[PDB]
Design a protein around this ligand. Structure first.
Ligand SMILES: Nc1nccc(Sc2cnc(N3CCC4(CC3)Cc3ccccc3[C@H]4N)nn2)c1Cl
Length: 499
């Protein structure tokens, strides 16, 4: 429910002193790493001392040093808080989250925002119950809560401002309880709304949205985010909302399915996973594959992992069952000496049987950025089930970070979109990388946003963090890093500029 153990604006020394003076043995927090930008550090207190554990994310997963790989920091913390002797050669316990007081990553916090700008934003894009917290422009250290109430400009709605005083490190609205953080204050008055005289209830229903913008304003917004809502503040605000997406992944945790996962803790949500049917009645569990349906709001997607040698047959069962006609692979088979995906397709002009499924590689066409493989997929023993599956194998995604220019990705996705659109009643587009959350989520999110612009031009609303959060509700940790977050903005900006 909460993610208060993540401190966005703290240093290693500040983490140590915070755990030593305000924590106990078993207390812990997470924080960004300043020695390795883009990475993170888990700081845990033990025996009166603090240990720092490195968590690196190059774009595919959160790699805890000496631990396991996870899709989100919340799923990481959730894993070790219920599994006692996993984290370590001495064993380490995650017992008490040390809660952050910084309101930086809260959706309703907007920092240095004037009272007139707050009224303007709430006027133009706010609804009944839309609220925000801003710094007081007159009293430094104080804050203002601005809420919109009314019926959903004729005076039927209004904007009310509530002063938040900071008195001896505590916050209050002029009376009642005093809170140790703006988060506790906001949470309290969401549960117990303020009622002014004459009966108006100041309902804190939803934060003010400042990320949804018109498509033509993307270039301006990217310029604002590149130099106090920046890229980091917006991304980390979205990251805080990952704690609402801790849905069960019990099917992927079953004993019969552990070896079907490339990474044992990066698993599909039960409620969106692709369930395979008509499996072998002798195999006890034959319905599982590490893959999720991704629906926008239009095409749909299957986000999945790179095949293992023992999941190739299930991969083709999935492609056949879901009537998929296009596969997007955004990784080499080997990258930096590490195996990311086994070769699940035949050589050119060759024919292979993968279990009950038969695949012919009809022709390969090589572009600079990608290779296209025209495959015929059919069930063995049934010559009436054949259908063409077009595999688009993106080859030039860099080993480190994201592409410096999105033109290769955009031309790639444009070709994939038109191939899919030209096939009547085609199923979802299969997208995969290694773990199937990082590059895969980035490609899918860009494709979703570009499809909106392709049909609506510049006169359409797009909301990058809202789209990512909606996609993240269907597969764990879709879009992994801030570099990918920035790349999505730049690809959308580049696509608009070439309209
Ligand atoms: N469903 C859904 N829909 C839309 C968005 C989201 S996340 C999200 C992402 N970004 C934002 N803002 C608003 C809050 C700020 C970042 C910009 C603005 C600001 C200014 C100064 C200092 C810090 C901050 C951040 N606190 N809100 N929600 C989600 Cl989860």
């Amino acid at each position: 429910t909460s993610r208060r153990w993540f401190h966005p604006n703290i240093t290693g020394v500040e983490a140590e002193n915070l755990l030593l003076t305000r924590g106990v043995d078993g207390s812990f927090l997470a924080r960004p790493s300043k020695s390795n930008p883009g990475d993170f550090t888990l700081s845990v207190r033990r025996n009166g001392a603090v240990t720092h554990i490195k968590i690196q994310n190059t774009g595919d997963y959160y790699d805890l040093y000496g631990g396991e790989k996870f899709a989100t920091l919340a799923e990481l913390v959730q894993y070790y808080m219920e599994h006692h002797g996993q984290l370590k050669g001495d064993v380490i316990e995650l017992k008490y989250p040390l809660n952050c007081a910084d309101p930086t990553s809260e959706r309703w916090f907007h920092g240095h925002l004037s009272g007139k700008e707050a009224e303007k934003l709430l006027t133009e894009k706010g609804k009944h119950g839309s609220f925000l917290v801003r710094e007081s422009q007159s009293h430094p250290g104080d804050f203002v809560l601005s809420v919109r109430t009314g019926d959903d400009n004729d005076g039927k709605s209004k904007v009310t401002h509530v002063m938040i005083r900071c008195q001896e490190l505590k916050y209050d609205v002029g009376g009642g309880e005093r809170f140790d953080s703006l988060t506790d204050l906001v949470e309290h008055y969401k549960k117990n709304p303020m009622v002014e005289t004459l009966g108006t209830v100041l309902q804190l229903k939803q934060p003010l949205n400042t990320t949804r913008i018109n498509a033509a304003e993307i270039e301006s917004r990217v310029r604002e985010l590149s130099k106090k809502q920046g890229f980091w503040e917006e991304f980390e605000t979205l990251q805080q909302q990952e704690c609402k997406l801790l849905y069960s992944r019990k099917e992927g945790q079953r004993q019969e399915n552990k070896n079907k996962n490339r990474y044992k803790n990066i698993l599909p949500f039960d409620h969106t996973r692709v369930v395979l049917h008509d499996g072998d009645p002798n195999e006890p569990v034959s319905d599982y594959i590490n893959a999720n349906i991704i629906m926008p709001e239009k095409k749909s997607y299957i986000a999945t992992q790179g095949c293992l040698q023992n999941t190739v047959n299930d991969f083709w069962r999935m492609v056949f069952q879901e009537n998929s006609r296009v596969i997007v692979m955004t990784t080499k088979e080997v990258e930096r000496g590490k195996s990311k995906c086994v070769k699940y397709w035949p050589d050119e002009y060759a024919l292979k049987e993968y279990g009950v499924m038969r695949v012919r590689n009809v022709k390969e066409s090589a572009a600079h950025d990608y290779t296209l493989r025209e495959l015929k997929l059919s069930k063995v023993g049934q010559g009436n089930t054949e259908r063409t599956v077009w595999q688009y194998h993106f080859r030039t995604w860099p080993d480190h970070g994201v592409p410096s220019d999105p033109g290769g990705v955009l031309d790639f996705l444009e070709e994939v979109h038109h191939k899919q659109e030209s096939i009547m009643d085609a199923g979802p587009v299969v997208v995969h990388c290694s773990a199937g959350i990082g590059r895969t989520g980035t490609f899918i999110v860009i494709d979703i946003l570009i499809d909106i612009i392709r049909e609506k031009g510049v006169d359409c609303d797009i909301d990058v963090p809202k789209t990512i959060q909606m996609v993240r509700s269907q597969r764990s940790g879709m879009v992994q890093t801030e570099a990918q977050y920035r790349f999505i903005y730049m690809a959308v900006q580049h696509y608009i500029e070439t309209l």
